[PDB]
Amino acid sequence: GGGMETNKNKFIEDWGSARENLEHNFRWTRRNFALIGIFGIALPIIVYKGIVKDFHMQDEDAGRPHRKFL
Amino acid sequence: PDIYEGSPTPVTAFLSIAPKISIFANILRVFIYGSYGATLQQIFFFCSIASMILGALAAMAQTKVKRLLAYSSIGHVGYICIGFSCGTIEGIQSLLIGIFIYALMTMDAFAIVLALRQTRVKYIADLGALAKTNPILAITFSITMFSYAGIPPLAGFCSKFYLFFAALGCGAYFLALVGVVTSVIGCFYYIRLVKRMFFDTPRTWILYEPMDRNKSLLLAMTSFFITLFLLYPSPLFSVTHQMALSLYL
Amino acid sequence: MYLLIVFLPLLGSSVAGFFGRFLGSEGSAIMTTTCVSFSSILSLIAFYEVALGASACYLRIAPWISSEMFDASWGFLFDSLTVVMLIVVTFISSLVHLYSISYMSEDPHSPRFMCYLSIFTFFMLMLVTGDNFLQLFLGWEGVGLASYLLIHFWFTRLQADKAAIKAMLVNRVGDFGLALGILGCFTLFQTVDFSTIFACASVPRNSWIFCNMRLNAISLICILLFIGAVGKSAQIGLHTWLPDAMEGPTPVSALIHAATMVTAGVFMIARCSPLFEYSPTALIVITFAGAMTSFLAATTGILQNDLKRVIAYSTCSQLGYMIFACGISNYSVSVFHLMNHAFFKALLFLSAGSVIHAMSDEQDMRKMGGLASSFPLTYAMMLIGSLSLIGFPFLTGFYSKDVILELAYTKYTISGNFAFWLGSVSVLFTSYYSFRLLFLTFLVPTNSFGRDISRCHDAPIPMAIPLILLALGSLFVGYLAKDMMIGLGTNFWANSLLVLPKNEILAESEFAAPTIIKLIPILFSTLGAFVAYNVNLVADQFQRAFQTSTFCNRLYSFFNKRWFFDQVLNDFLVRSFLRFGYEVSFEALDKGAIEILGPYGISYTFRRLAERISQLQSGFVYHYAFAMLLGLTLFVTFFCMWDSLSSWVDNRLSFILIVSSFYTK
Amino acid sequence: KWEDWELPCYITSFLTIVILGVGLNAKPDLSIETWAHQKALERLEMEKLAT
Amino acid sequence: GDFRAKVWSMTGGPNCRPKHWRRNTAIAMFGVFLVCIPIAKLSAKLEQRPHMPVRPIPSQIWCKNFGTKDDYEKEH
Amino acid sequence: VGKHIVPDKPLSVNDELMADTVGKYEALAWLSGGLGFFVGLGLLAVLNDKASKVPFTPRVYPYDNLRVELGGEP
Amino acid sequence: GFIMEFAENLVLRLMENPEERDRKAREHIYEMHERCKKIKEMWALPIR
Amino acid sequence: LEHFCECYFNLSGLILCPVLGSIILLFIPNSRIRLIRLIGLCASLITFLYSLVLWIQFDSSTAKFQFVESLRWLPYENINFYLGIDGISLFFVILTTFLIPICILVGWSGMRSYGKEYIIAFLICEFLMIAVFCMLDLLLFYVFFESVLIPMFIIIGVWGSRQRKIKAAYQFFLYTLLGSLFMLLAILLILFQTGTTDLQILLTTEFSERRQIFLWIAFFASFAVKVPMVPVHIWLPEAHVEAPTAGSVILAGILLKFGTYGFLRFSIPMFPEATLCFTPFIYTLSAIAIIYTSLTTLRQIDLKKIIAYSSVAHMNLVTIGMFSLNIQGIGGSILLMLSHGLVSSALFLCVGVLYDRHKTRLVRYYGGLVSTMPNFSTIFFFFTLANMSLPGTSSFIGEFLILVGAFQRNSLVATLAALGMILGAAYSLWLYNRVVSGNLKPDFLHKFSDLNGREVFIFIPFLVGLVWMGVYPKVFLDCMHTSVSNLVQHGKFH
Amino acid sequence: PISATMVGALLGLGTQMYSNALRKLPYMRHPWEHVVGMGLGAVFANQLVKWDVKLKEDLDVMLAKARAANERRYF
Amino acid sequence: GRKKGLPEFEESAPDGFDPENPYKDPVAMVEMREHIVREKWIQIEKAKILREKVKWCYRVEGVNHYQKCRHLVQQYLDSTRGVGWGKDHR
Secondary structure (H helix, E strand, O other): OOOOOOOOOHHHHHHHHHHHOHHHOOOOOHHHHHHHHHHHHHHHHHHHHHHHHHHHHHHHHOOOOOOOOO | OHHHHHOOHHHHHHHHHHHHHHHHHHHHHHHHOOOOOHHHHHHHHHHHHHHHHHHHHHHHHOOEHHHHHHHHHHHHHHHHHHHHHHOOHHHHHHHHHHHHHHHHHHHHHHHHHHHHHHHOOOEHHHHOOHHHHOHHHHHHHHHHHHHHHOOOOOHHHHHHHHHHHHHOOOOOHHHHHHHHHHHHHHHHHHHHHHHHHHOOOOOOOOOOOOOOHHHHHHHHHHHHHHHHHHHOOHHHHHHHHHHHHHOOO | OHHHHHHHHHHHHHHHHHHHHHHHHHHHHHHHHHHHHHHHHHHHHHHHHHHHOOOOEEEEEEEEEEEOOEEEEEEEEEOHHHHHHHHHHHHHHHHHHHHHHHHOOOOOOHHHHHHHHHHHHHHHHHHHHEOEHHHHHHHHHHHHHHHHHHHOOOOOOHHHHHHHHHHHHHHHHHHHHHHHHHHHHHHHHOOOEHHHHHHHOOOOOOEEEEOOEEEEHHHHHHHHHHHHHHHHOOOOOOOOHHHHHHHOOHHHHHHHHHHHHHHHHHHHHHHOHHHHOOOHHHHHHHHHHHHHHHHHHHHHHOOOOEHHHHHHHHHHHHHHHHHHHHHOOOHHHHHHHHHHHHHHHHHHHHHHHHHHHHOOOOOEHHHOOOOOOOOHHHHHHHHHHHHHHOOOOOOOOHHHHHHHHHHHHHOOOHHHHHHHHHHHHHHHHHHHHHHHHHHHHHHOOOOOOHHHHOOOOOOOHHHHHHHHHHHHHHHHHHHHHHHHHHOOOOOOOOOOOOOOHHHOOHHHHHHOOOOOHHHHHHHHHHHHHHHHHHHHHOOOOHHHHHOOOHHHHHHHHHHHOHHHHHHHHHHHHHHHHHHHHHHOHHHHHHHHHHHHOOHHHHHHHHHHHHHHHHHHOOOOHHHHHHHHHHHHHHHHHHHOOOOOHHHOOOHHHHHHHHHHOOOOO | OOOOOHHHHHHHHHHHHHHHHHHHHHOOOOOHHHHHHHHHHHHHHHHHOOO | OOHHHHOOOOOOOOOOOOOOHHHHHHHHHHHHHHHHHHHHHHHHHHOEEOOOOOOOOHHHOOOOOEOOOOOOOOOO | OOOOOOOOOOOOOOOOOOOOOOOHHHHHHHHHHHHHHHHHHHHHHHHHOHHHHOOOOOOOOHHHHHOOOOOOOO | OOHHHHHHHHHHHHOOOHHHHHHHHHHHHHHHHHHOOHHHHHOOOOOO | OOOOOOOOOOHHHHHHHHHHHHHHHHOOOOOOHHHHHHHHHHHHHHHHHHHHHHHHOOOOOOOOOEEEEEEEOOOOOOOEEEEEEOOOOHHHHHHHHHHHHHHHHHOOOOHHHHOHHHHHHHHHHHHHHHHHHOEOEHHHHHHHHHHOHHHHHHHHHHHOOOOHHHHHHHHHHHHHHHHHHHHHHHHHHHHHHHOOOEHHHHOOOOOOHHHHHHHHHHHHHHHHHHOOOOOOOOHHHHHHHHOOHHHHHHHHHHHOHHHHHHHHHHHHHHOHHHHHHOHHHHHHHHHHHHHHHHHHHHOOOEHHHHHHHHHHHHHHHHHHHHOOOOHHHHHHHHHHHHHHHHHHHHHHHHHHHHHHHHOOOEHHHOOOHHHOOHHHHHHHHHHHHHHOOOOOOHHHHHHHHHHHHHHOOOHHHHHHHOOHHHHHHHHHHHHHHHHHOOOOOOOOOOOOOOOOHHHHHHHHHHHHHHHHHHHOOHHHHOOOHHHHHHHHHOOOOO | OOOHHHHHHHHHHHHHHHHHHHOOOOOOOOHHHHHHHHHHHHHHHHHHHHHHHHHHHHHHHHHHHHHHHHHHHHO | OOOOOOOOOOOOOOOOOOOOOOOOOHHHHHHHHHHHHHHHHHHHHHHHHHHHHHHHHHHHHHHHHHHHOHHHHHHHHHHHOOOOOOOOOO
């Protein structure tokens, strides 16, 4: 009846606040350890080596030695 | 910290500045001039590191303005003594520059504290909504806190700049790491006051009496110095170089 | 005059979109139809001057992206292939504009509909007329957009919004591959211009590094480009969007997802024939894709109950025929089937809409029947379109479908044999659902509701006029245009299409083939019509097999739910990525470990450290004196009594113990 | 009634088109592309007529 | 419906029936035709036809770029 | 349209995003079999070896198989 | 008289001179590279 | 050496304009709100026109720094600072001068409660941001970059909508300060070698590969926080969401550009050998950020969070382009940087339009808006398309050029980077449909107003700029290619 | 141009206004004090410039002596 | 002020550039870098002029482009190998 502001829903707002405060829920469980290990460590290392290997395969296509990277 | 809190506030303001000038003059003329060497400077190196770390942590733990200022002064003497530790001409010059800038900044801060002591300021939370009740005082005090934190181009950067200059000059990276971490901690507990004066919406406000002419004039001058020193820093640099040279010749 | 062809539909859409509040439903309908129809007439003139007069037109407006050798340009190319596609697009769009004038008369938002119709047309013109890969990409994406806007034109309907997003996401996967091929093209030839690339395509022989694999550069480019044709032409893998695109209005299905845009993948393979000709590996891949698609869409469409769904699966089957025709190096035949397809398929969708409009928006064939005498005009156009689609002799569909099946038999390769078997069996399957539709909709005893029957009416004039014009097309276009398009040794295409000498099979396909091979489609089509008559007019216990047998019931659902393709791809692919963005990248990493090993953990530890350091200042003077004394003792010990200690101590140990003291109690 | 922002904004908008519409079309073409194009034309001229 | 009558939109909203829609439609016709005139002139100026048609064609009336790119080893 | 449902129960996660009669892995097995039909058909095409029963000799084009006309050395 | 020709000159009057701009850039580098030695003597002066 | 300029319009006047505006606004009483508004808006608009004139006199044939003017610090002249721009920094000065008047116009209606502090904070931000982009010295670049932290902190904390702004402002300040502290160490290490901080001298000095690697790591520690790269990007969603609308515009449209600008101005040209060594490392971090943050964006439920997270993926694609080290990659990276500052700024303006009326950022409340705000829905759709890098929009030019430049170096990284075409389409259209399409929900929202005259005008230069770059990027690329070419060639002589 | 006198006068006037504002008084309360502050600021800025010049001379003499003492080492 | 006309640059490489130790004459080092950039842009325009020739030969000759433009395609493809800053170094 009055105003343009949204009529707040307690359940929808609770869903909103629980999303913003997710860091209080982290527990270091088995599932988290597998997820962080696979996608925080293993996958970036796989992408890193794939990119290096792509450069190196070019080097031996040009008759050049393998370029050094950090 | 205990004497700074418990003493009458003008005593705290006086003890914060003058004795340090005089004792550092003594330290220069005794040690830099006498000659035992390495051990003497290692003393001051280790004490500087301990001072920076402990001052930063303890200040981060404080809820009262006077204690926060005491711990900030402890941290800053750590930064200054890093200059005495290196034992070079630029070390002495930077020690003197750091002393001068810290003294002017402390005079600014205690002018504000004595101004707010007419309404009995005690806690950091008492400064809530000061940007509404006295916006120009909240700006002047925020400038002092950002200068204490070393944010360029305020005068406080000058001293911070040296810390890292000597750390990479005398070849000391653990000192550099301590400086980076403690600078970040100091920045946090200084900007907490700016947050209290500007971002908070307390239910109960404290209205403060306006300051007298003496403190307003001193505050205006020191605040102009703090914002504008890096535009014309030549006289201080020249005079401190003169003093560093005159220690030996 | 050539710029007026491309930009007239843009002008028509601009007036309806920006100024539709001044024209209303009637004004915006006239404005967009007139501009598109004028562009249609100029397109007929352009076909006469470029194809019949053998005079190509090249037009360059200005550069688009000029960065070193990168030279994307606002440039237009009008050759024989272009003016064929201009005719198909402008003519069908003009009819669909006329058809929509009365089909959407009762819709509240007709002016926005007509505006979207014309903007689609403009982008499709920009796709077929561009002279470089980047302008084609602009048309490629624009028709992806206009299709999205038209599928959810009823924005209040949630299934339309689900269908429009799916159409755009599936095509972005195709655009992903298409863009990669364009990147590969530039790296190899140092240009995106069509004429330069085709003139140089025969030379490169180098190998390339792609995803840590040594591959042939030309083959890599051609396969990446074909991924683009897989998305737009709904080929196996990226095809589940086409049936769901029926959520839009019927005119949208006729123009966009049956005649013009759905064939952009076929046009692009044909336009790039001078490049695709130098990758036999790509041609084999293309042969397998089309052949499988034709079977996948035919078997699925024999159990659909919705009119628009059946015709949508038929569209996906004919596209496979076009694609594997391109795969056997017959681009003139695939384009010939393209234009032929644009006539009877459009006639079938527009005729379906008239039945649906007549039957109060009923679309389920199980609630129709006994409508031949109630709607004579509509049934007649549907018979012509259907008989032409199935390849009845001497109709438009017969002169191209049969030649593709003949050429596939003549291809003496594994992929050619694969295509012949799968293309031939699909003819039986397409004849079944074509007649199954007719019998259920208009010939069986009525299965419908009375209130619908007592409110029937037949096509108004603006709806019937396009149907009669498309009937004439779906009866005579094929015969009239054969010798022009695929006449033996024809020069109609000039330099538009390229078939290398080693790949030419048309003569052998017409002379060296046994007579039985050319009669298999009619023999297969007859069997499908007879089977449809029996299942839908005689069998009465047939359905009981599925209502009692578990294997036969799952089999019914297997072909009804499209080989459970959407399901598998939703349960395994979409859900996997959706779950990853919350449980892994956000909860486990961003708001998990990164927070704990960052701001959240750092604040916690430093708060505890500050609390402990604060407790040192205990307020007891004795502690301050004790601290001073300890500092003195420490100084004396370390800086004077450290001469004989180095025998028993190390510097490493000392600092280790000081830090280790922090983890006490 | 025009709001207080309209006049300064519509004058800035007008001056923006005039400066960019005139200035960009009136500044000389000094791109490395235009200079090298002319330079490359003469070198291909100079190596063609001479052997 | 009820509230959509108070909502302004460029395309006119639902069931848009402007009273003077005929004079506005005819005014819109003229604008497109006036817009088309510079487009056609620029098109005719820009077209390139390297090949003479087998028979005379309508674009030989306004286009003067027929059989011009014969010297291709000179294009830059 | 009619009346949008306003929540009355605590909203759970995965609600921003929230195929009936056939199970998940059973659908994967049926689709796998369907794709296994194309695989077996393709293998049958290899086993057939239609390329080995071609009823004509490869086209030969004049002028050295149009070597010059195809971009070769003139 | 003509708008564009006036603007051609007007923009040309506003641009900096290329020869002087390059000259000053060259001198800046030359002088700083031969100047980079003076100050580093001061940081090396013995405190004692 | 007084390297003063002969041009009439120079960089010092442009730097002085918003400073004069702020000084004047210092002394105007808060009862004269009309005057405060007019003076602030006029100062910003004159700065925009001045920068346009700087564009007009730009010389696109030189690789030297243009409009170079010297500013003296000590009469000893040992330390003397230079200002100047090239094809890499000119358009960013223009973008700053253009975005500031937008920031003033957005808060026009609330100016009676914002006060002169709001305008002064933004005018002070303008002065520092213009200066940062015009610096030819490592030390002055450092000092001016940190100066913006003070007003940005103030802007976020004071005028943020809800008390999460406290945490947001803290995190922004602390992350940025940490990064700037690592840059300071490298500046002082460079100064120990060279005895100078003048950029032009540094571009002519040789570094050892060992110390090149180390100094590059020290520059990366600051720039990767600025960009931001994973895993130090988590400050961004909090700061960009809790800020006021104009604060979000400044944060995403200008401040984000400072890390990528620092990569182009210092790290890439000054340490060519280290840059080659760290190219697989940059490629990996950018590729991960593009894939991962795009998927996080998909699962966000706050309007401003979806737009904030999209900014991270766009900025990491920029880093792939600049580290491709060719004309297309670096040329495309600068164009995407400019395009992002227009597209994301316009998108933050659309969300702010919705928030000022209804005071909520949760997507669940909205929906059906096309039936009540068709004008906003059309403008929102256009910038939605531009965020998807639709061909014909400004963002497609930079995006494709970066992919071209990446493909010519490493086909794998160009392939992973091209996956953002699929992912970026998914979250942009899902956002648009859940807000605009569907049916209204009168139990949450029942009272509606479309855009007014001020909001439509605000959107006009964003539409014109996006179209102008999307169809004719040549006016920008022409003025850049000479500086881009010499940046690529820096450190090689063949 | 920008002389020391003008910078000092502006700084002194600003110092009087800042003082009045910190005390919640009108900016121009007691204008004769604004005149006095302008004069004092001008005098202070000019004297600072002169003092800086003198300081430089003294430093040069001191640095000359230090370098002579250091060069004595290599005799 | 600036005189009207196309920009003017020295045709020859700077004198004072030792390719053995490029970091010894910096003014020449910078001037060599600019000269190489300008030289590389000349070859870029060379391939683009050569590319316009291939384009119009294809358009003019049609089905006979393989024999009639054999020479132009070779010239263009040779000019594009090792051009600009692409996938070839020198």
